[PDB]
Specification:
Chains A, B, C: This is EMILIN-1. Three copies of one chain form a homotrimer. By secondary structure, the first copy, chain A, is an all-beta fold. Chain A has a single domain, classed as Sandwich (Jelly Rolls), CATH 2.60.120. Chain A has no helices and nine strands. At the B-C interface, β1, β2 and β8 of B face loops of C.
Chain lengths: 131, 131, 131
Amino acid sequence: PVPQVAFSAALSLPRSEPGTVPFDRVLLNDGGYYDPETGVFTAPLAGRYLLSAVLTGHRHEKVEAVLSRSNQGVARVDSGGTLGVFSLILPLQAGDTVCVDLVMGQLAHSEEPLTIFSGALLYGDPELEHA
Amino acid sequence: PVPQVAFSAALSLPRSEPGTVPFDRVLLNDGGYYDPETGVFTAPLAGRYLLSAVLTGHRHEKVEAVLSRSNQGVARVDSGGTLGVFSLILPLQAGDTVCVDLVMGQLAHSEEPLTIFSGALLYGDPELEHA
Amino acid sequence: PVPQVAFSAALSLPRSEPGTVPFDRVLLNDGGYYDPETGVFTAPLAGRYLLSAVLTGHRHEKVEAVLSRSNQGVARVDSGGTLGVFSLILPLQAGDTVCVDLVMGQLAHSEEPLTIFSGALLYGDPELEHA
């Protein structure tokens, strides 16, 4: 079968938000899949996909680690402003769920950054079962 | 049909140029397609291609926006040293033409940077017509 | 035929190492292929692949240049902390070998960085012989 899925959201809101940031630029994103507000990504994709996150500079400090499914830790979108760090590929399980942790010190300053999350299907695995 | 096209030019000229910068490294680029001097890209590709631009840091200021076809604005190779910004995907029309605007303030300094422009065919769309 | 190869190693070693750095996170890498300790990449792949190296900032200086096969020089993983620089494509020969040169000054500082080396097979060439 061919699942033909792509997803890509962009953010360009005008000024100061009342809270957590949504997305208004559906650039291609037929099913929705990953809710980017809570970051709860259900991939049914089950092939090799091409992933690209946009990292906000924030030289002011604070450690950002996007938790990865099956192991915890495993910062794949890693920024230091059993466990491995990877950028290009994607050991993601079918139906499993990634979650962003943004809590690494409480003596911080208030700031709201802007984030772009693209992610397009490259290869859907075609059965690949032998006996 | 299979159009089997790739294009990728590179720049490694020795020193100070008399004007606008050409390309001597045809890395793979059978037809030529995009003239990178005037930046006039005719894509007959008409499927999904994988685009990667190389962004020169230039912290000194000046806003750089590569104009996109069909809408104007639409900075896809965006650097802030109807309208959306995208990096991974490519809504490009068949036969349409992209152009680089490099004019955002006239009280600037003279500098000549070096730029690498790759772009390879991933998927040619195979008819995809039903009735 | 279907060559079905992917390769990607990751590094998350705990602290201060006695020399050149190996890899403990085989994330997907069935044959192994490229030993990144000695940097001796044997591609039998013979196809167009998408390779991406992670560049350590190192603002302190020192010229980094990864030698490319068939020409010498030709820095493909280029960082300025007949010869061309390319990021996306790969004019690489079957069975030939790329090597990192890390020697551009002797009056420097001692440092150890951590490096992640991904590289995934996009297209295996399917004969493409006519007469």
